[PDB]
């Protein structure tokens, strides 16, 4: 029954400069709320703290070696991070976009199959998107590397095939009952 919080609010609350920054992030990133950003500012701070500790340790130090390499390999699987980075010295010099860039929502834009970070989120939350055998409704997801290619509309949502739409199918029978017969 163990549980933990996933976000952290900023010490302080009114620093125009920070607020604007966050708003630009929501906009580019079809985000919903500040928490939506706060959640990531939080995710990142822990990663950076994880990193900083490690970087203070001796290199070759079974603890530093075994966990450093792991943090890196984890950070790379998600594309968040790259090789020269792909050492700890580079994660220290990293940022939020790099995570934010891997969510669904922005990808369904990023290859035509949405044309909007907008469209993207309503598409995702509405069941028209599988990551290869599996519908994924979590506009919040995190697309892994060799998983980038398997993202596509789903086997039945109409695009993806399958009749029309509880509203399109309404319209077909909308030209049927009246204009066909009585």
């Amino acid at each position: 029954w163990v549980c933990r919080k996933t976000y952290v609010t900023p010490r302080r609350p009114f620093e125009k400069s920070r607020l604007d920054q966050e708003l630009k992030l929501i906009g580019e990133y079809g985000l919903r709320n500040k928490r939506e950003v706060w959640r990531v500012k939080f995710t990142l701070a822990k990663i950076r703290k994880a990193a900083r500790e490690l970087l203070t340790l001796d290199e070759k130090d079974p603890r530093r070696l075994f966990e450093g390499n792991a943090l890196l390999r984890r950070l790379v699987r998600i594309g968040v991070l790259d090789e020269g980075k792909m050492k700890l010295d580079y994660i220290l010099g990293l940022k939020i976009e790099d995570f934010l860039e891997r969510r669904l929502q922005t990808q369904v834009f990023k290859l035509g199959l949405a044309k909007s970070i907008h469209h993207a989120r309503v598409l995702i939350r509405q069941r028209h998107i599988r990551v290869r055998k599996q519908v994924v409704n979590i506009p919040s997801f995190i697309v892994r590397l060799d998983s980038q290619k398997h993202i596509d509309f789903s086997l039945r949502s109409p695009y993806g095939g399958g009749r029309p739409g509880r509203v399109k199918r309404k319209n077909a029978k909308k030209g049927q009952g009246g204009a066909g017969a009585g």
Partner: protein, 263 residues
Amino acid sequence: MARGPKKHLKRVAAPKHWMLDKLTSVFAPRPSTGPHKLRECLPLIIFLRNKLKYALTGDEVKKICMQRFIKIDGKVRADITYPAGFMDVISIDKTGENFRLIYDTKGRFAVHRITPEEAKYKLCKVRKIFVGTKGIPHLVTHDARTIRYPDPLIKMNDTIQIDLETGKITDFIKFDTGNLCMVTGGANLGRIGVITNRERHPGSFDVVHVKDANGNSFATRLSNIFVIGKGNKPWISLPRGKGIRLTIAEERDKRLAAKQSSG
């Protein structure tokens, strides 16, 4: 509490090395009284339905046992929470399988099939060696088996090949510098290795410096050392891994290399 013997085990307060999950219920099996101490044992139920996957329910484990399907050291055992342990045999017949309970390098009772022979005999570490009643002498092994009239060489900490149908020691190994060893508890639980040194303390606590087939050295308490034969010559099956112990990096190196390609 405080008037009598506990009969329940809150799961979570059970021994880790059974690897029972956290959710499921409140209580773990809790080993019956038997030949092995409760921490250091493996209730059959965990074996039948937690390691071997023969059973799903506990209701099933029982249904299996009442058949008589299963013997420990040769002699049908019919209790769900029977406390089986190190050097025990376990034989399911109408299935043809013989397993010896001996450790992982994790320190987990390992699922270790043994031949249809071997299943005959087990190696017990002498715990005490005794002049019993009427002037007879006896040895006592870890697994709580008392054998009278043993041969006079046998001394505490030596190990001893028991027949098994008959009881009957059918030889022995002395504890001396250079013997092969199995580690039966503590940080090093599961590591196998030669010896090197026994540091001796009066009052209490003797340590055994062990060296593995990789020139990896480590200590434990004498209490934790079990003799299993002569270097390169175990007197039993060893599980895959030869109780080696590999660094978490070495462990990763093996895991990714053996597969996603390498057959």
